[PDB]
Amino acid sequence: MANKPMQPITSTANKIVWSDPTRLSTTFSASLLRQRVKVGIAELNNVSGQYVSVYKRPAPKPEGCADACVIMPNENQSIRTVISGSAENLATLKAEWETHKRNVDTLFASGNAGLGFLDPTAAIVSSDTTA
Amino acid sequence: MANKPMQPITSTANKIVWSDPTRLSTTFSASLLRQRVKVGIAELNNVSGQYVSVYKRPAPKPEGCADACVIMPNENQSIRTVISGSAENLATLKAEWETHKRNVDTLFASGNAGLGFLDPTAAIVSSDTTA
């Protein structure tokens, strides 16, 4: 009852879907997506990575008749993240890791998604650049 | 020389692109993308959020002739993340925040993007569910 590890449900490749029985109830897979190598004449390997996960949580009560009176609520969420780029990606990733977490952390603390809008004081900061 | 804050270049709406002069020199445009309501008969507000980023860092020094001579390299990265879902999203996000960080943190520590492939020991864990 501490960690919430997920397990696959029939799959064997670079695109395997994972899910839990009663942990998160989520289900999805994550694979790499190499493409869009714009601006890259000089020899430079191309790296990328895509990960998507869905979260579903329907009402507890059972089903019934949906005609006169029926109330069967359900939750539906989806998260998609993709990152691609030349070899330099391995470097931008480390910086983007703490940057994508801070930029989104400050946007939720200053802005409000409940209205699909943000404030003019969107002061976002990045991890770093060098020492 | 501590924080790397970003600023807009020219915009005024829910979709504005920010960047820095020398800090990161990368363009980032955030915008709310509401869609795909899916199973959601019961009254439940719809929330979402999409964020796009574009990293660019070309080799130093000026340009020259690109025919019988050698050209300078250039780095190019891109990060796209989007999340949508009913009101439950507000709660799911909190959990997905630490989950998307650990799931991706363990995938990079166990797997290798350099080969666009991962290992069979992809033991990913989620934040939590309840107490």
Pair B23, B42: CB distance under 8 Å:
no
**What count of other Cβ atoms lies within 10 Å of the Cβ of residue A64?**
10
Select from A81, A82, A60 the least CA-distant residue to A71. Answer: A60
- Rounded CA-CA distance B67/A27 in Å is 51
Å from A47 to nearest chain B CA? Answer: 6
> To probe the interface with B, which of A92, A96, A110 has the most B CB atoms within 10 Å?
A92
Q: Which amino acid is at B121?
A: T
Per the CB < 8 Å rule, is B4 touching A96? no
Tell how strand A46-58 and strand A74-86 pair up: antiparallel
Nearest to A78 among B39, B83, B123 (CB): B83
CB under 8 Å, gap of 24 or more: what pairs does B5-12 form? B5/A123, B5/A124, B5/A125, B5/A126, B6/A124, B6/A125, B6/A126
What residue type is B1 in one-letter code?
Answer: M
Q: Report the distance separating Cα A131 and Cα A127, nearest Å.
A: 12
Residue of B nearest to A58 (CA): B39
Separation between Cα atoms, residue B99 and residue B88, nearest integer Å: 16
Sign of CA dihedral B89, B93, B95, B100: positive
| Region class of A85: left (phi > 0), else alpha (psi between -120 and 50), else beta | left
On whether the CB atoms of residues B44 and B18 are closer than 8 A, the answer is no
Give me the residue label for tokens 């400050």: A106
- Among candidate residues B79, B68, B129, the one with its CA nearest the CA of residue A24: B129
For this PDB entry, the determination method is NMR
Find chain B residues with C-beta within 8 A of A75's C-beta: 44, 85-88, 92
Longest dimension (CA), chain B: 67
Q: Where do we find the tokens 């033991």?
A: B123
Report the amino acid identity of residue A26. T
User: Cα separation of A89 and A36, whole Å?
Assistant: 13
